[PDB]
Structure 1
Amino acid sequence: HKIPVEADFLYAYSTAPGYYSWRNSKDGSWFIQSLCAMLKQYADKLEFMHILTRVNRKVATEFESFSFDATFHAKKQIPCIVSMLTKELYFYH
């Protein structure tokens, strides 16, 4: 007769716990760039978790940092999908 108060929440983090999150001054953040591209291409075709999975792959494979500072050079990023959802989510019907 009740549901958890924390149920039905989805947290789409740009990066893994404890990690840096990369942003390009001209193109925007790696994550948001990728999220919008995948939503534009798949929102009317795929369930949300699968769209977010494509976002994870796009960020993980197509981006790598470039810095004059060796400390921040050639780094990678993996987004982090945190789901407390109880049903599949489709933006269309």
Structure 2
Amino acid sequence: YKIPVEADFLFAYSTVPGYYSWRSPGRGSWFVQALCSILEEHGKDLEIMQILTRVNDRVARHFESQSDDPHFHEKKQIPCVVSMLTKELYFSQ
């Protein structure tokens, strides 16, 4: 008849553990770009995991870093979702 003190948390990280996170001085961080984009189209009709999953794919397939320095050139990124949620989350009705 109790609930875990750690339950119902969800962490949507821009990148996986141990890696850098990319951000465009001009367009903003990739993850945020992605997130907003998706949220604008489906924020009110898709479940949170569906939304974030599509954000992962978007970040992963739509971005590649550009840099004069070849060490930081053509590198990729993949967000990381941590769910402790115990239900489906919808931002509507």
| TM-score between both structures, scaled by the size of structure 2 | 0.98
1:3-41 Cα shifts (integer Å, max 9, x gaps): 110100000000011100000001100000000111110
Stretches of structure 2 lacking an aligned partner (at least 5 in a row): none
Residue deviations 1:30-81 (CA, integer Å, cap 9, x gap): 0000001111100111101000000001000000001111111110000000
* Alignment RMSD (CA, Å): 0.5
1:40 alignment partner, SS class: helix
Return the letter of the residue paired with 1:62: H
Within 5 Å, which residues of 2 pair with 1:1-93?
1-93=1-93
Structure 1 ranges of 4+ moved more than 2 A: none
What is the identity, as a one-letter code, of the residue corresponding to 1:34?
A
Distance 2:43 2:15 in 1: 22
> Normalization by structure 1: what TM-score?
0.98
Looking at structure 1, the residues matched to 42 and 13 of structure 2 have their Cα atoms a distance apart, in angstroms, of 19
Q: Is there any run of 5+ residues in structure 1 with no aligned partner, and where?
A: none
Identity of aligned residues (%): 67
